[PDB]
Amino acid sequence: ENLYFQSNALADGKILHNQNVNSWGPITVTPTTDGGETRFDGQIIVQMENDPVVAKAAANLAGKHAESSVVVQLDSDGNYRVVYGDPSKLDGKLRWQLVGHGRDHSETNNTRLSGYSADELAVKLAKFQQSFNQAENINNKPDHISIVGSSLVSDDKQKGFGHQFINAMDANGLRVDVSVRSSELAVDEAGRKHTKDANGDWVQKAENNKVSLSWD
Numbered sequence: 001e002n003l004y005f006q007s008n009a010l011a012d013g014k015i016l017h018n019q020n021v022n023s024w025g026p027i028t029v030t031p032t033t034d035g036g037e038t039r040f041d042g043q044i045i046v047q048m049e050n051d052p053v054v055a056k057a058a059a060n061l062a063g064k065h066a067e068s069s070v071v072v073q074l075d076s077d078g079n080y081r082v083v084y085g086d087p088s089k090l091d092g093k094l095r096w097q098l099v100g101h102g103r104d105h106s107e108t109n110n111t112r113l114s115g116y117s118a119d120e121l122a123v124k125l126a127k128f129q130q131s132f133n134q135a136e137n138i139n140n141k142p143d144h145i146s147i148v149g150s151s152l153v154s155d156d157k158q159k160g161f162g163h164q165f166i167n168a169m170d171a172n173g174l175r176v177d178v179s180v181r182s183s184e185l186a187v188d189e190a191g192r193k194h195t196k197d198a199n200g201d202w203v204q205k206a207e208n209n210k211v212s213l214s215w216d
């Protein structure tokens with residue numbers, strides 16, 4: 001069990017590959033059925049790097065709400081490809097879940113998601129919104145961003161990547177709520193997230209491992 005999770009922890013993938021989306025490996029979603037109520041009418045799972053753990057996590061997240069999820073692979077040039085789902089159905093309250101490995105540890109934990117600083121990520125997402133909305137003729141923006149990478153906010157939840165990111169997103173014209181984890185993070189086969197607690201056990205719904213940043 002813990003074997004599966006440490007193997008799937010979303011930190012420090014050895015080979016960073018975020019360039020040229022056409023060269024990325026595909027994903028296949030296996031829709032699952034036990035994931036009950038979601039407040040989002042639709043969501044985009046944004047795969048930020050070509051890594052097998054990241055690809056698997058993105059597919060698993062999609063499978064939890066297969067009918068209303070779109071998976072996009074998004075590269076360093078801002079080119080993307082829709083690898084799962086129907087962008088034209090995205091309506092109502094939307095979430096984006098960003099999937100990638102956190103890297104480059106500091107006193108406030110990881111400083112990079114899929115090779116991007118908080119500010120670079122915000123720029124990439126703002127360009128992505130513009131490009132996607134015009135290519136797919138959608139006009140919807142997220143209400144929430146869930147950061148699906150390991151340890152991207154400080155242990156005390158006051159500093160780090162998540163804070164720089166929510167502020168940078170707003171400075172780029174996207175005011176959104178952001179959920180982000182201070183612990184190691186992994187996604188199971190049902191698309192549920194598990195975090196590593198203080199003892200070192202992989203656990204579910206540990207609120208001390210997550211913070212939800214908001215414009216109150």
Ligand SMILES: O=P(O)(O)O[C@H]1[C@H](OP(=O)(O)O)[C@@H](OP(=O)(O)O)[C@H](OP(=O)(O)O)[C@@H](OP(=O)(O)O)[C@H]1OP(=O)(O)O
Pocket residue numbers: 035036037038039040064144146179180191192193194204205210
């Ligand atoms: O309702 P549940 O089955 O317990 O699932 C929740 C819910 O996700 P769904 O949209 O899939 O229902 C949360 O979404 P919120 O409305 O709270 O945002 C999500 O939180 P994030 O959006 O922050 O990712 C949370 O994830 P976590 O385990 O980090 O709380 C996740 O629970 P699962 O991990 O069990 O899917």
Ligand SMILES: [Cl-]
Pocket residue numbers: 039
């Ligand atoms: Cl709500």
